């Protein structure tokens, strides 16, 4: 259909523009649709983009507005005093501010639909809220409406919520357009999506991105596919991966690298209200935090992740048990049988379930996939689904059968309730992935498995050595394999923090010289150096000129292949802020060949300082551009839980950074 209004290039400099003569009479019916292309790269703290109101005295609570905050949040208000209606829908982290030194054209689409009694907002091709009321309030049915306003709301004659920015195009429709039509409205997005709600993973939520450029030029990406909101385990999470063969222009329909089936892969809309937002999927097994590297010698691609048995995450993780019993050089996975109160079984060679108390094998066995066999026949369990139908999270059986897995709740033999690490491998550069295998323990029986640092492993340019940074309390623990990931040894490096979350990423400054940048609890990003290919590690230092928060945030880094100002260069991706996870930056450091020290010359703000920015992934593309797959929200704030499509991808050229 056609618009009943269409104006444009409205500049908003803390002064409201009246357009009521150009709209109010054309308002008709109980269903409207607003489409607005706008820019705000310097917004006020809270500001109205568009507004209908009742400006007459005694009716300051009678208005529709479309507002944004400088945290990037967007929302509508719908208020009518005489009806006793005060609606307030919004979603944080819904906007872009700047990109490549320029204002982003945001494309806002708000549909008000009285047939379905639903309010729905889109920004930049993404749906950020869709709410249904029992008592619908048409935005043109607000009693006594007399003003249509751009960049403020006119209440009792005054401008409230004055906006700074601009509205290049705005148009209204006397209909509720279908979801189908919304997708037809062209976008001017500065970003694109790899993983998204509705894709093959069926996860409404995504966290913990990774980027890697293969020898072929293929770019690989792995992700936490999180089903029960954006929570860390305990939850249900799978590891999903997807690649790109055109420098990051197009991406493949994601497959799973790691997956459990104890729970149904459901696209749920996790609740965002204060009472229910702490709901966790508590009975499921999961994976958190993946990391990728490529082995030059074999050709294999190698993915590691943390593994959680049913119920378990970091909070209740059996700190001080590895899950394995050591019997002369060997590490056998411990198991508990239903009814027992201690772990009286182990898994020996060929998956045979061996009894300890008797030293006799049993009629039970474990296959490739950590499933359970009895006499060679496959035991099963019944899958769980989740729903909120009774106004409270319920986790019940759904009638479907899956193979019994030792990481599952209902399983006959359960593994130790602690955290492990698994590796999987791809012989075809990420088109499929082998069944995962558990990595051994490295710090003794009576110590829990360490925590894989998410992002990139390191493949040393002038050898076959592969390294994956992991962390535990008190140290960084590098895992090192010189045989294509078949065997591993550890290399500890003491860090001056008890119980830190020391997420580490490495760079190779020149042959055998690895610098690791890691997250601390001091507000400052730390680092250490190796000069024997990771064998031994230096003492800790700290980057000045980048600020983090007291808890801090994952940092990702690459060595750039090219020279910048004649010196060898290194790029950091991190939030740059000491309040929260916002103010994303790519920071360029030039290496000094005298002491291998780094001069942090260049700061590039990915978006506005006040706009959200969390865990990130960088990679040097085949054509020397930079890919950045990142969480565009405050992944720490309890106000920005459960947000769809905030993990986003962008393409930059060096010149943008310098």
Curated annotation (Swiss-Prot):
EC number, UniProt record: 3.2.1.18
Placement of BNR repeats on the sequence: 242-253, 424-435, 479-490, 528-539
EC top class named in words: hydrolase
UniProt keyword annotation of Signal present: yes
GO biological process terms on file: ganglioside catabolic process; oligosaccharide catabolic process
Alphabetized GO MF terms: exo-alpha-sialidase activity
Record bears the keyword Protein biosynthesis: no
InterPro entries linked: BNR_rpt, ConA-like_dom_sf, Glyco_hydro_33_N, Sialidase, Sialidase_fam, Sialidase_sf, Trans_sialidase_dom3
Residues that, per the record, bind substrate: 207, 519, 581
Any one GO cellular component localisation term in the record: membrane
Catalytic residues of the enzyme: 232 (proton acceptor), 503, 615 (nucleophile)
Keywords attached to this entry: Glycosidase, Hydrolase, Repeat, Signal
Reactions performed catalytically: Hydrolysis of alpha-(2->3)-, alpha-(2->6)-, alpha-(2->8)- glycosidic linkages of terminal sialic acid residues in oligosaccharides, glycoproteins, glycolipids, colominic acid and synthetic substrates
Coiled coil segments of this chain: none
Gene3D superfamilies tied to this protein: 2.120.10.10, 2.60.120.200, Intramolecular Trans-sialidase, Domain 3 (2.40.220.10)
PANTHER family per the UniProt record, alphabetical: EXO-ALPHA-SIALIDASE, SIALIDASE
Similarity comment text for this entry: Belongs to the glycosyl hydrolase 33 family.
Name of the protein in its database record: Sialidase B
Gene behind this protein: nanB
